[model samples]
Target: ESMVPAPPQLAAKSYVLMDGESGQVLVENNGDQRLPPASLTKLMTAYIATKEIEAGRIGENDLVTVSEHAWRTGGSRMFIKVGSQVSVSDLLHGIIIQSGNDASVALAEHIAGSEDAFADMMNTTAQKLGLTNSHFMDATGLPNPDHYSSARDMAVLARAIIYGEPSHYAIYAQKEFLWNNIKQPNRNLLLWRDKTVDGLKTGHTDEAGYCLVASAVRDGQRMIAVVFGTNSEQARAAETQKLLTYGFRFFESRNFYKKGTELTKGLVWKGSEHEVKAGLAEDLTMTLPRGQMQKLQASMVLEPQLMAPIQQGQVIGKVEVKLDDKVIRSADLVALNAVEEG
Candidate 1:
């Protein structure tokens, strides 16, 4: 709780800066306050769509009919016409690059059959992802008393998109997308302002205010910054950059261990195989203040009395990470492969 300073002054209603790989909350202020997310909600929408593509449930080339409801969506427009057949890939580019409300509604209706139903899917995904302070009342983020999210929740969604589907996530960095021969430029300014800025989404409404979720990579470390309820387009991007600069300048991340990296071999009794390898199920990435790595220490503890018939990925030990003699992080070490019984 004591880590502070080095961050620039911010004027947004709420904001958060996070370490993307490490899942560490670096800097936050009213990060969980429920406020209108505007089009930042599209992050979840795009996430679900990307996952559908990955799950074999949907394909990018599949065509969707543009319904009147979608074509008439009032906010941003992809200029999609009614009854026109648009491919999923095109609509995605529209939603991400143009921040088109029309495109959002179009995909929502196609994916879930209606905007309302699609909002339900968004809520379920949000809950599954542990976004505790978020709810979805509409796909376009036009604003409802019931529709709201927070800085922290948006960061979680951004990380998912950046890591969960790298190929599709690249769409966010696009400067402009062509649809219906209308070139709709992305509303996110950081993509143009900073070479390192690659993603995310932007939002605005009379009620929700300007909001931006931005991600940037510097020196092999990625950071996600969420600023909600800023005054204008320029302010949101400007404030987001401040957080990014502060994070890259003052913090550091180290991936000390990759998943499946064998740490130790343990003897197994009463098994066809006499031994089993132990390792972490996920990569062990650590985010720390600058110059803190030299003070870091790590040690592993294996469970005593290992027996045969051990299953693959079964928890068998633990790894402890310490700083200044204090345990900072711990991870469960599991069996790398199944050991058959004798």
Candidate 2:
């Protein structure tokens, strides 16, 4: 017996696939070009909300009162009624599972006291996450001329969300949720059709077309693929799945270095110990062929110099691995132990 091969359905204006842990671009096409993200922008909203929950400022059980502004939000909705009270956890489920614009506004208002304020927080978070080509004008990714993001930026945001807070980020994988006596299914069709597809979001608008940011994990390695401006929902899923499949088939992650493994030692300026050990704060993984480890080269970029009084885990530089002049992966170099002035 033979199986039919899946044809490539990717028709996006821009796209990208990256190794979640190593930040390696496995496949790309116009990845840095800016395009309307549509509702995919809500990923930033969810990211901020997760941060608030982790900071102890908000709890899953905290109640959020829906306002007229939230209820009247124009796009996809959870059908939340004004003046109705909903818990943060439920609102999160509504927003993520149903891609509810109203729920997004509700959660935004609950967190920052206003949707505008929360949008500001989203922009701030984007900048901090190194999403250079992205901006947020509102909590819901309605078609604002100014609201846009590049595929590369979206991939960066996706990786940051999953890596910075994995436990809370798992909410994206949910298949369905019930709220206000209504059951809504997750819009990310790949989750239901493909077992390897676990998460992320999907978006669509006349202007933005269909967009998807899908993620999956296999063999302890995770990959994120972003596709924007496709023709339809099916096209979006097919394109994203193709990219993910290509990534998994062509690449593999190898850990040549582990966290806290000393790579080198350097002299400290006017320090009691006269020298300090520098190592990675986290493991260094690279995506390449099976026997390409020998082709990897490490280059260190330091701060030109470091003064005394350096604390343990302080970032002093980066160790980048390159293959044939292309960067494969990089790790931060930090002081393994504190260094005090003489």
Candidate 3:
């Protein structure tokens, strides 16, 4: 199991691999071209649903009723019968682990009151997440005349899901689960092939071909690889594997700072405290190939130059890493502890 290899000849229109932590492009080929996404659309649906749950608008134990529309959905299904009630957690399991189109529609309708409205939310979220090359017409990644996404956009979506709601994204890592009395296994082969590979989404359709947005974490560093329009499942897996291997082999992550540890102290205004300590909520690290570390440097920028009544975990600035003056990776700097009115 070599983690580094030459890029393979993939029968796809586009592909890309990036270090998730550093946002470094390891391999890319027409990754910006849009194409049908098939079941991969569910990843966005899952992300939005998780956001709603995090906002306290929904709960995992909340029961969702399946609609005629959700039950009628074609493609991979959980066999959810119309009018039957299922828990939000179960629907998530079906959607992510089983790739159930029916479960996706059910969850969508539950969250947005209808599948159509949910699709609108999905597109809006994509826009906010900077997935400019993606559009969604359905909760399930079924064949839609206008629904499509690019490999780069898919990577963006994947990164958002992992970073925005890590607890929810963990559902995709389940290798097996029981749905409707039937045990189902995840379709992602990378789980068995690479222990470092954690979770993401996979899709296939006559129109979309084979597609995958795969992710993994190794030695505290995370990476994401997106491959779209492949000819077959085997080819998608092989090509994606090659991409991940290239990333891990060529690049290594170096931790420059730990989360919650002050990077610097900044002046404050109109507060009991006259200064704010800036830090990250989590450990910060960057990926670069061996010998390339010397060429990398970071620039820090603070917002609201004069802070006022800053709260703990409040964002006040960003740390941007650059290579040859080109920005590569960045993270927000937040108040490590609360500051009161001075």
What clash pairs does model 1 have? none
Measured against the true structure, the TM-scores of the candidates, in listed sequence, are: 0.87, 0.91, 0.86
**Which of the numbered candidates is closest to the native, going by highest lDDT?**
1
Residue-wise lDDT of candidate 3 within 77-124, one digit each (tens)? 787779999999999889988889899999999999988999999989
Alpha-carbon runs more than 4 Å astray in model 2 = 1-9, 164-167, 289-291, 301-304, 324-328
RMSD to truth, every model = 3.2, 3.8, 3.6
Clashing residue pair totals per candidate (backbone < 3 A)? 0, 0, 5
Q: Give Cα distance to truth, residue 99, candidate 3, Å.
A: 1.5
lDDT of each: 0.87, 0.83, 0.83
Model 1 clash number: 0
Cα error, candidate 2, residue 313 (Å): 3.3
Residue lDDT tens for model 1, 51-84: 9889988899999999999877887789998999
Best by TM-score: 2
Q: 2 or 3, which is superior by TM-score?
A: 2
User: How many Å off is the CA of 282 in candidate 2?
Assistant: 1.8
lDDT of 2 by residue, 200-267 (tens): 88878888788888889877778899988888877777788788877776677887788887888776
Q: Worst lDDT window (10 residues) for model 2?
A: 1-10
The TM-score obtained by model 1 is 0.87
